[PDB]
Write a protein that binds this DNA or RNA. Structure first.
Ligand SMILES: Nc1nc2c(ncn2[C@H]2C[C@H](O)[C@@H](COP(=O)(O)OP(=O)(O)OP(=O)(O)O)O2)c(=O)[nH]1
Ligand SMILES: [Ca+2]
Ligand SMILES: [Ca+2]
Length: 579
DNA sequence: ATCCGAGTCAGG
DNA sequence: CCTGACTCGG
């Protein structure tokens, strides 16, 4: 047991201009949830306050909003939003222990202070699972244990602040935490709290048609299958297809036989049920995930949806979006995209405005690779897909049929991570002999992409890690693995990580430089979303002319590469219409 | 119950 | 290559 004042009230010696602060949201989704406890640690001691009391105090609430009071926490963003929900603001966070651990070694998957502490040999603090538990397991314990815990954390944060910073500084990532991640964290905070408005009525009439649509196919499947079965269980389905209907087994999952859309395109010719199955899956994924899914989570009063961008999960520096995931709304098949029509501004007479990097990930290859061909393609603003098709067929700026392009494109999608001939051949539905025969041609057509791939794999061998434009790391012990396929995975990570990685650094940065301008220019615009390479804003309809310059200007100039980045922008009265 | 793992597919 | 949500079913 470790002692601390167990406060009933706020003494001012809790308001020192530097403290580790802990603000416990024990709910798994932080949006509008109970704050269960608050521990503060400072030069004057270690204190515990109950939220009810604490949150009422104009003295405390004041200290919180003060950017001159420096706090140190773990996942300030969790506390930030939870507090924004209470109309309380949180400023002057100087060190976030979650973001730090995450830059040191994202693979450790640090989810709580206990994890962060292992890293630096500190152990007088307990995991979350130990105090709370797993599933229907997780519960809020009594104050005695709670106080003890929130303090032990806060204590650790105070303690680990400089051990952590010293390794970042040694690692060459001091300005990644300070200038990049922490600034962004605030920004995501606002974004998640702003929310995006959904048109629940249109979502309702989309679902309405899809059930009638779906009933229909369902029946047809059962008709031609000869019997009923749960189509969704592919274990049950394969039995219908490859046993009772006697069909060729072409691909195979590690368990039994495979029914991935890839195999079905191939089985189509073989029997009329095949395409009915594909239709059924597509229609059903809309309804399950983008109708019943979203509608399950609009906030009923405001009609908005509040995502959580997880700044500290991905192994390569992307963000992720959870519950719901606004980073995978349909856009590819035309009927899918209609969903986007349900994403509307939150103010009458405002517009969604959306801008994105053209080929960001490739452009980064070009810059990191220092291949001449690719650098020139981007500098002359050539349609990079069209130039690719040319180079792999050795043909003209018009002898490119549309199919030669669906092919060139797919290379550019995989050459960002050393795609396998086998792997490629899958997406393209071709013979593996042709897959590598396009690969072969790409490489002699862009042999600076070849070197890089050679080189990066060997730097990974030397250093045990790769890095990115802004010095994010990724360790890769499996690089020297005994085992062909494991060494191989690790070798594509070896080469792809600096690409995904910089691409993400660059946009995270664009977002900071953006908030920065909008705030100076007194503008009403604010970011709603990030989808890996686009930004989505809502602004007053009288503000587009500006954003059309501003947003591209700031995005393009976010960093400086041996290629010019390229941005596209569109705005409409909905997401669908900004395309 | 309740957890986890694969599967499939939506996006990058 | 990097995710996540929904789904069955060991
Ligand atoms: N990794 C991956 N990303 C894809 C794939 N297909 C589409 N994308 C995503 C990644 C890009 O950020 C985004 C670019 O949009 P498009 O697919 O329409 O390509 P783009 O507009 O650059 O070319 P286009 O103008 O359509 O000829 O799409 C794929 O097969 N793999
Ligand atoms: Ca395009
Ligand atoms: Ca895109």
């Amino acid at each position: 047991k470790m002692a601390f004042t167990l406060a009933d009230r706020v003494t001012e010696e809790m308001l020192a201009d530097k403290a580790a602060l802990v603000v416990e949201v024990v709910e798994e989704n932080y949006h509008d949830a109970p704050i269960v406890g608050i521990a503060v640690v400072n030069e004057h001691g270690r204190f515990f306050l109950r939220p009810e009391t604490a949150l009422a105090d104009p003295q405390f609430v004041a200290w919180l909003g003060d950017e001159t009071k420096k706090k140190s926490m773990f996942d300030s963003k969790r506390a930030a939003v939870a507090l924004k929900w209470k109309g309380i603001e949180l400023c002057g966070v100087s060190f976030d222990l979650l973001l730090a651990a995450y830059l040191l070694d994202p693979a450790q998957g640090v989810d709580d202070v206990a994890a962060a502490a292992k890293m630096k040999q500190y152990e007088a603090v307990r995991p979350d699972e130990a105090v709370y538990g797993k599933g229907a397991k997780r519960a809020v314990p009594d104050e005695p244990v709670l106080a003890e815990h929130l303090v032990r954390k806060a204590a650790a944060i105070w303690e680990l602040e400089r051990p952590f910073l010293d390794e970042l500084r040694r690692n060459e990532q001091d300005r990644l935490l300070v200038e990049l991640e922490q600034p962004l964290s605030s920004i995501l905070a606002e974004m998640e709290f702003a929310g995006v408005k959904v048109d629940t009525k249109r979502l309702e009439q989309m679902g309405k048609e899809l059930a009638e649509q779906l009933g229909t196919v369902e029946q047809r499947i059962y008709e031609l299958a000869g019997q009923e079965f749960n189509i969704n269980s592919p274990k049950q389905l394969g039995v219908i297809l490859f046993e009772k209907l006697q069909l060729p087994v072409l691909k195979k999952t590690k368990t039994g036989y495979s029914t991935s859309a890839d195999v079905l395109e191939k089985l189509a010719p073989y029997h009329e049920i095949v395409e009915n199955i594909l239709h059924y899956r597509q229609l059903g994924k809309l309804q399950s995930t983008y109708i019943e899914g979203l509608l399950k989570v609009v906030r009923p009063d405001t009609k908005k949806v509040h995502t959580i961008f997880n700044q500290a999960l991905t192994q390569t520096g992307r963000l992720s979006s959870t519950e719901p995931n606004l980073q995978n709304i349909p856009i590819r098949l035309e009927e899918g995209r209609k969903i986007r029509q349900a994403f509307v501004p939150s103010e009458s007479d405002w517009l969604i405005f959306a801008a994105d990097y053209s080929q960001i990930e490739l452009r980064v290859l070009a810059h990191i690779a220092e291949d001449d061909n690719l650098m020139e393609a981007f500098r002359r603003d050539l349609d990079i897909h069209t130039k690719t098709a040319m180079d792999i067929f050795q043909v003209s700026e018009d002898e490119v049929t549309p199919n030669m392009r669906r092919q060139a494109k797919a290379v550019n999608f995989g050459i960002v991570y050393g795609i396998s001939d086998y792997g490629l051949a899958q997406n393209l539905n071709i013979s593996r002999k042709e897959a590598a025969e396009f690969i072969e041609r790409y490489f002699e057509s862009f042999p600076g992409v070849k070197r890089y791939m050679e080189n990066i794999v060997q730097e990974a061998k030397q250093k045990g890690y790769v890095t990115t434009l802004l010095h994010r790391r990724r360790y890769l012990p499996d690089i020297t693995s005994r085992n062909f396929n494991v060494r191989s995975f690790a070798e594509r990570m070896a080469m792809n990580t600096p690409i995904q990685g910089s691409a993400a650094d660059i946009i995270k940065k664009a977002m900071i430089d953006l908030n920065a301008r909008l705030k100076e220019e007194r503008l009403q615009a604010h970011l709603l979303l990030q989808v890996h390479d686009e930004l989505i804003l809502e602004a007053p309809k009288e503000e587009m002319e500006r954003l059309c310059r501003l947003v591209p200007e700031v995005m393009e100039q976010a960093v400086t590469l041996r290629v010019p980045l390229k941005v596209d922008y569109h705005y409409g009265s909905t997401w669908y219409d900004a395309k």
